[PDB]
């Protein structure tokens, strides 16, 4: 069972811009029936009140439903739509479209890019940031691995998740139902949803043993983390959507993925290590990049390499916005291109203050 | 001898503007040795990273030290400096200067304005938002009442407090010392400091019995509140400073204070009730206003009179900023003047979504 | 006979159509008779506010599918004016205008009437200039006819959506060798709003044409309309006009009245607008359908002699602050923060003030 | 013979003088030899940033008390340039310049030299206009003399603090019958920065006087200085100038070099500036005293053909975003986010770029 994955990084002019995707479909380069996932950077604030994420998904679902002659509801059941808000600094809004199809092809000369998709059930507000979310995410990650035809967790290089958050109305509704939520704070709820989801990845991949994970460890024990999880929260969904990206011997793709882990927000060495892991060994081979995907965050200590910063004290600009600008700038300075995927808030994703970074590259 | 309190509401051009106070001192209207407290609205963001509060205090302490021929340290030991940041909407930056004269003259008939000042000990970071802060504030409020020569809590109409907050550096240092702080969030720490301080007022005044107050109730049980507490947090101090304002039979002041409680952020009726309680019975009598002092906040329900608002969901503008703009605008529309004191974050200060409102008026 | 019905509907998010769908499914609203929807959407109300477009897309998709027509036809048939920015306590909502033909006598006197017109698309270099003024003026007169209002004194509110400049549009104009009115995205909203407002004043006879030139736009604050309400967005390239007034040829059980806020804290003008709409005492406040107002920071940096930081605050843009203030003032008078307040009142009321209208049940 | 010593000191808050006090109390700094302090302070770096003034007041009060002189005399003697905005990972700090007269001989080649000069106060209506250009140019020449630098090729960084407009100052100008360069407080910072930078270019011969006019300021991006670094603030009414370069008549154990970032992600220019200061490999990075750079949003709204939102974002002003980006780029090259990055680079390097200098131990 050979599958071919193709990946298209498409600049966008606004959250609702489908024109670049339409161009690739109209020219025959993309059969829209073979799209399995779209990962976006959308130009809202990336925090609670970011409606560019939902706007982008609605616009893509409308377009694809009408191209395929099916309902928007069926498109959303069939295709993962993960919109990561926040395009701070020089970060360029874009979408990354994953196309997958069965092919009649012989055995790869090694392992090549593979992608799998799985969705969880919807969560009650009082399940976010708790073991209910951890365990359901872990189940879905294992399902997505099977979908990708990856049996060895060491061949998984990036697990991208969209997960829910709490709004004031959802917290108050939980209160009226007699239920207490993990945190009575809309912005901080994103951290708990991101972190519980990341711990689900680590559980599913065997990066952390189950006996170490409990409600009390979530967003507290930073010794527990996944080296490939990348999680992103939004008002526009009530479940978790999972994209597993790795390499498989059952892949006929002309692409590979590699990764490293940024030890902190300015770790350009880790960017170069991720490039090398994807087969890019010199600046001359940089044109083989399809995209770079990374997590960024403010370290809980309030410092980087012992130097204070204000990210956790700044009441005007939220810390995930600042972290995204910084890490996108670092990556852009290495690869010469700010149109790369950077997502903020890296709870249990790499060490405290760091985050996984993956590169999808042409062979 | 006999206390006489005079109160001067002075517009400012910037946080460091001492010119209006200097004009009143140079004219002989204010003897600087008789200043006991200054309550400011300063034009920073009113949140964690607001340095206009400390800048204003430093500028006033420098100026008064040089006028009095004493050290800045002595001025700060002797005079309360309470700088409430955040001048959103049309709210006009200003300071309110409290002068206490000792006069060999009769008391005025009835009860007239009286002011008392007390400072607590410094608090360790791990004490903010907990019973150590509640109980020490209650002790100091009783001391300030004695300083004001008010022996009946019913004659206390406004208790204004400045209290500390947590920064990322202070939280990390607490962690290094093996201590758990009340909340691992700088902005939310302001709410816990404000709320514990307000409960200390309620305890001291007999508004709430001690047996109802515990660490678990702080910033949770909104049935517990003071009807006169007004608390404000800042990076620029490590203790609580307290100004008790009320009326005393042993006073020669030509001023009185009255108050009410806003039931919600748009309760103009409560503004008019506070004016009436201070002897202002018609629009023509509003020229007797010296200042209006009020607390404002976002209700935990995310609504006002059943109508949703975004204050608790908005990741760009923090909720205390929004609440200050709203309540200042409401008061300004009643009294015709936006140069009034409005402070945001009213945990245990009036009901959830409301806050105390006092008026100092000429007789 | 014309009969206008108006529904103020709370929304849970920019894309929330549930309240409108409830009214349609119950038979209160025939979707074919909707002529305009005026929204407050919870984005920042400035340049990078996509809640306006998200709301319009969601409503157009819902109505297109209910009516069995294309979204393109819906947007030609219905004015969608989405005013972003729900600061302070201001409650997100939509106001739906329904116009029916009824076989009943016109009501005594004058009753609510509405008209809609659209302009052509504008080139970036036309925004904030006489091209926009004159084309809006033509559309306003067209919308007056649509409303069957002959006397401009019977127009009480003219709501407009107009375009703005983004960095990409400015750069494209540069590449084409064309200078724009201002090389500033946020300020371009002011020029678009102001030129559109002067178009209203021109069409209504509030200001004679000889007084208006490119040089006076966003400069001569003596020139203003007392009924114009303009709002800018990235989501359109033309101007959309809703004229609201009263006509003798109307059978609506609603009326509209208005006043002008002299400044951002002018509660007296709120009460005057209520009275102009027939609400003369507090106990009649439940006859409000909605209140619609413009708010702005005064160029002097003061209100009633008192400084504020609106024009100096680099964190929060001045139209956000003005909306929070004026919504709070109105809410404190009427007891309800779910009213329409739009910021940036260039040539709309005096400098620092803005028109305020009340649609009320008779 | 002049010897310049430079101390980069982390700060805990805008008013933190403890690190400087420690260097004085240990005998490493004689406070009477301080000639300039260049700070990064943690306010927003825009109009309503009072951390800059708070930092200057705190340092002037500390130094006045240590020296037994008045604060007023300290401010007449020492340049205090506080650049607000510490976005991203940028670490608040101050850089203290100490100049000693020493009997030592002629150190081989050229070594670090510093000079200081102040302009007169400007009226608000003078900001962004030729009067500011010309007065700054005269002060830059005076500062070069103070530094004992006669050749403009030996000037590597000219750091300036300059004024801005607030609403109150604009109203003052209007009351006096004057118009200001722009009726926009945030944009006024760009005009003050840009006019000041053109004054540097004029003084250094980087542009000819006949090419500079009021109309060119903040419009002709072909006119720029490759060493000017300008920063605006509410806390002063004049321009303060620090010229940093190398002189044959210097005994400093430090040198300065520079390059120009072509855009906000130009790490090659960071490396070039390091190499120009004698740092030839990653293992010599420990010789850095500080890195000083200008950052800005390009007028095109793009970096290397890729769109960004810096000029469209109504929540976060573009100089805040540019500072975060360029500090992150420099930090990733040198391994330390405690470097000086200032935003808004009008006529400082190309459009979208800015000068970058390195002070390094020999
Ligand atoms: Ca992490
Ligand atoms: Ca309260
Ligand atoms: Ca106006
Ligand atoms: Ca430049
Ligand atoms: Cl109570």
Calpha distance D167→A228 (Å, rounded): 51
User: Within 10 Å of residue B138's Cβ, how many Cβ atoms?
Assistant: 21
Test D44 with C315 for CB contact under 8 angstroms: yes
Ligand 2 centroid, distance to B320 Cα (angstroms): 12
The CA radius of gyration of chain D, in Å to the nearest whole number, is 19
Instruction: Give residues with Cβ within 8 angstroms of A114, minimum separation 6.
Output: A3, A5, A148, A149, A150, A155, A245, A246, A247, A248, A250, A251, A253
The number of beta carbons lying within 10 Å of the beta carbon of residue A51 is: 28
Q: Nominal resolution in Å?
A: 1.5
**Touching check for C53 and chain A: CB below 8 Å?**
yes
Which one of the listed residues C110, C161, C225, C259 is annotated catalytic? C161
Region of C125 on the Ramachandran plot (φ > 0 left; ψ -120 to 50 alpha; else beta): alpha
DSSP state letter for A36? E
User: Which chain B positions have a beta carbon within 8 Å of D314's beta carbon?
Assistant: none
Domains of chain B, first to last: 1-107 (3.30.1330.170), 108-253 (no CATH), 254-363 (3.30.1330.160)
**C-beta of residue C234 within 8 angstroms of C-beta of residue C49:** yes
Which two tokens mark B277?
Answer: 């309680």
Chains interfacing with B (3 or more CB pairs < 8 Å): A, C, D
Q: What are the CA-CA distances from residue B136 to residues A268, A276, B200, B201, D75 (Å)?
A: 50, 60, 7, 10, 43
d(CA D107, CA D87): 39
Token output for D179: 């118009």
Round to whole Å and give the CA distance between A13 and C235. 12
Q: Which of C171, C168, C117 is nearest to C140 (CA)?
A: C117
Report the alpha-carbon distance of residue A329 to residue D324 in Å, rounded. Answer: 8
Q: CB distance from A339 to chain D under 8 Å?
A: yes
Separation of alpha carbons D293 and D277, rounded Å: 14
Q: Alpha helix (H) ranges present in B1-130?
A: 19-26, 52-68, 72-78
Chain A, 125-184: which have a CB under 8 Å from a chain C CB?
A: 169
Report the SS3 class of residue B171: helix
A: neighbours with 3+ CB pairs under 8 Å?
B, C, D
Closest CA to D46 of A43, A317, B313: A317
H runs (alpha helix) in chain C: 18-25, 51-67, 71-77, 130-147, 167-175, 185-204, 267-276, 318-334
Residues 6+ apart with CB under 8 A from D172: D124
Token code pair at residue A317 = 């600009």
Instruction: Return the ligand number nearest the Cα of B348.
Output: 2
Experimental method: X-ray
To which H or E segment does residue D271 belong? helix D267-276
A109 DSSP assignment: S
Beta carbons of A51 and C42 less than 8 Å apart: yes
Residues of chain A positioned with their CB less than 8 A from the CB of B318: 315
Structure tokens at A37: 């996932």
Say if D14 is an interface residue toward chain B (CB within 8 Å): yes
Tokens 């991101």 — which residue? A194
Please answer whether residues A322 and A298 qualify as being in contact, where contact means their C-beta atoms are separated by less than 8 angstroms: yes
Please state at what angle helix C185-204 crosses helix C130-147, rounded to 10 degrees. Answer: 50
Cβ-defined contact of C308 to B334 (cutoff 8 Å): no
Contact criterion met (CB < 8 Å) for A185 and B186 = no
What are the φ/ψ torsions at residue A311 (nearest 5 degrees)?
-60, -35
Q: Do B51 and D58 touch (CB under 8 A)?
A: no
CB contact under 8 A, A314 and B169: no
Q: Contacts of residue D300 in chain C, CB cutoff 8 Å?
A: 167, 171
Distance D217 CA to ligand 4 centre (A): 13
Tokens 């990078």 sit on residue: C48
Minimal CA–CA distance to D122: which of D83, D59, D61, D172?
D172
- Residue B233, token pair as written in the block: 């947090």
| Structure tokens given for D290 | 């500080």
CA dist A115 and A250 (Å) reads: 11
Output DSSP code: residue D136: H
Residue C15 contacts A where some CB pair is shorter than 8 Å: yes
Q: How far is the CA of A183 from the centre of ligand 5 (A)?
A: 26
Query: CA nearest B303: which of C165, D361, A168, A317?
Result: A168
List CB contacts (< 8 A) between D51 and chain B. 51, 55
* Under 8 Å between Cβ of A115 and A216: no
Distance D176 CA to ligand 4 centre (A): 34
Neighbours of chain C (3+ CB pairs under 8 A): A, B, D
Enumerate residues 6+ apart whose C-beta is below 8 A from C170. Answer: C124, C180, C183, C185, D301
Bind-site residues of B: 53, 84-85, 194, 232-233, 297, 324, 343-344, 346, 349-351, 354
Q: What's the longest Cα–Cα distance across chain D?
A: 60
List the one residue out of A69, A71, A39, A68 whose CA is nearest residue A56.
A39
- Give me the residue from D50, D51, D61 closest to B62, CB to CB: D61
Query: Which residues in chain B have their CB less than 8 angstroms from residue D315's CB?
Result: 316
Helical (H) or strand (E) element with D114: strand D111-118
What 8-state DSSP symbol labels residue A215?
Answer: G
- Assess D283–C contact: CB distance below 8 Å, yes or no: no
Contacts of C319 (CB under 8 A, 6+ apart): C45, C46, C85, C189, C295, C296, C297, C343, C344
The closest ligand to the CA of B343 turns out to be: 2
Q: Which chain D residues touch C173 with a CB distance below 8 Å?
A: none
Q: Chain D residue closest to C45 (CA)?
A: D314
Residues making up the annotated binding site of B for Mg(2+) are 297, 346, 349-351, 354
Residue with tokens 């999680």: A231
Query: Is the Cβ–Cβ distance between C10 and C93 less than 8 Å?
Result: yes
Spatial separation of the C-alpha atoms in residues A133 and A231, rounded to whole Å: 13
| Interface contact B251, partner C, CB < 8 A | no
Beta bridge partners of B244: B116, B159
- For the sheet with D288-295, list strands across it: D254-261, D354-361, D288-295, D340-343
Q: Are B150 and B249 in contact (CB under 8 A)?
A: no
Length of chain B: 363
Q: Say whether B249 sits in a helix, a strand or coil.
A: coil
User: What distance in Å separates residue C50's CA from the closest CA in chain A?
Assistant: 6
Please choose, from the candidates D19, D338, D293, the residue with its C-alpha nearest in 3D space to the C-alpha of residue D156: D293
Written as six digits, the tokens of B235 are 């990076």
Residue D161 annotated in active site:
yes
Residue C335: which region, alpha, beta or left (left: phi > 0; alpha: psi -120 to 50)?
A: left
- Which tokens hold the place of D210? 């006949």
Inter-residue contact D279 to D358 (CB < 8 Å): yes
Angle between helices D51-67 and B52-68 (to 10 degrees): 30
Which of helix, strand or coil describes residue A25?
A: helix
Chain B residues with CB under 8 Å of D54 CB are 15-16, 51, 54-55, 58
Contact D48 B43 (CB under 8 A): yes
Chain C residues inside the 8 Å CB shell of B338: 265, 303-304, 306, 308
How many other C-beta atoms lie within 10 A of the C-beta of residue B31? 13
Q: What are the residues whose beta carbons fall under 8 Å from the beta carbon of C357, sequence distance 6 or more?
A: C156, C157, C227, C229, C244, C256, C257, C258, C273, C277, C291, C292, C293
Residue B150 is given by DSSP the state: -
CA of A195 to the centre of ligand 1 (A): 9
**Number of residues that this document lists for chain A:** 363
State the Cα torsion A134-A136-A139-A140 to the nearest 10°.
Answer: -110
The alpha-carbon radius of gyration of chain B (Å, integer) is: 19
Let me know if A29 is a catalytic residue. Answer: no
How far is Cα C325 from Cα C337, in angstroms, rounded to an integer?
11
Residues in CB range of D151: below 8 A, 6 or more apart:
none
Distance CA B317, CA B328 (A): 17
Residue B181, phi then psi, degrees to nearest 5: -85, 165
| Nearest-CB residue to B318 (from A169, A188, A315) | A315
Neighbouring C-beta atoms of residue D174, cutoff 10 Å = 16
Of C89, C306, C315, the CB nearest to B337: C306
Contact A3, A101 (CB under 8 A): yes
Say if B210 is an interface residue toward chain A (CB within 8 Å). Answer: no
Distance CA A198, CA A187 (A): 17
User: Distance from the CA of C311 to the center of ligand 3, in angstroms?
Assistant: 15
Choose among A49, A302, A315: nearest Cβ to B313: A49
Residue pair C117/C140 in contact (Cβ under 8 Å)? The answer is yes
Helices (H) and strands (E) in chain B, counts: 8, 14
Give which of D258, D233, D244 is closest to D344, Cα–Cα.
Answer: D233
For chain C, what is the largest distance between any 2 Cα atoms, rounded to a whole number of angstroms? 60
Centre of ligand 4 to C-alpha D144, Å, is: 23
Q: List the catalytic residue out of C188, C196, C231, C247.
A: C231
3-class DSSP assignment, residue C288: strand
């Amino acid at each position: 069972h050979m599958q071919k994955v193709e990946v298209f990084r498409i600049p966008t002019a606004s959250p609702d811009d489908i024109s670049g995707l339409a161009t690739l479909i109209d020219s025959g380069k993309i059969n829209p029936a073979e799209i399995v996932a779209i990962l976006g950077k959308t130009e809202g604030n990336g925090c609670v009140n970011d409606f560019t994420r939902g706007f982008a998904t609605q616009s893509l679902a409308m377009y694809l439903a009408e191209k395929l002659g099916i309902s928007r509801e069926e498109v959303v059941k069939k295709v993962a739509f993960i919109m990561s808000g926040g395009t701070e600094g020089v970060m360029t809004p874009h979408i990354t479209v994953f196309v997958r199809k069965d092919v009649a092809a012989p055995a790869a000369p090694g392992k090549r890019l593979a992608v799998g998709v799985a969705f969880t059930r919807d969560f009650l507000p009082e399940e976010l940031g708790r073991m209910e979310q951890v365990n359901e995410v872990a189940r879905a990650v294992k399902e997505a691995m099977k979908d990708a035809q990856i049996d060895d967790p060491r061949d998984v290089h990036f697990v991208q998740i969209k997960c829910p958050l709490l709004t004031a109305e959802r917290i108050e509704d939980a209160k009226r139902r007699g239920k207490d939520v993990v945190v009575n704070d809309t912005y901080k709820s994103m951290a708990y949803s991101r972190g519980a989801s990341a711990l689900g990845v680590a559980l599913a991949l065997g990066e952390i043993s189950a006996d170490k994970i409990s409600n009390e460890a979530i967003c507290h024990d930073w010794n527990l983390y996944s080296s490939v999880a990348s999680t992103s929260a939004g008002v526009e969904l009530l479940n978790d959507e999972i994209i597993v990206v790795g390499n498989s011997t059952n892949s006929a793709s002309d692409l590979v993925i590699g990764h490293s882990v940024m030890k902190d927000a300015i770790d350009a060495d880790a960017v170069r290590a991720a490039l090398k892991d994807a087969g890019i060994r010199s600046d001359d081979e940089m044109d083989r990049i399809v995209n770079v995907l990374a997590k960024a965050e403010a370290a809980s200590s309030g410092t980087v390499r012992g130097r204070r910063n204000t990210m956790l004290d700044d009441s005007d600009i939220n810390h995930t916005r600042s972290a995204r600008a910084v890490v996108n700038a670092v990556i852009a300075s290495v690869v010469g291109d700010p149109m790369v995927y950077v997502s903020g808030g890296a709870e249990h994703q790499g060490p405290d203050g760091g985050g996984p970074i993956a590169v999808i590259a042409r062979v």
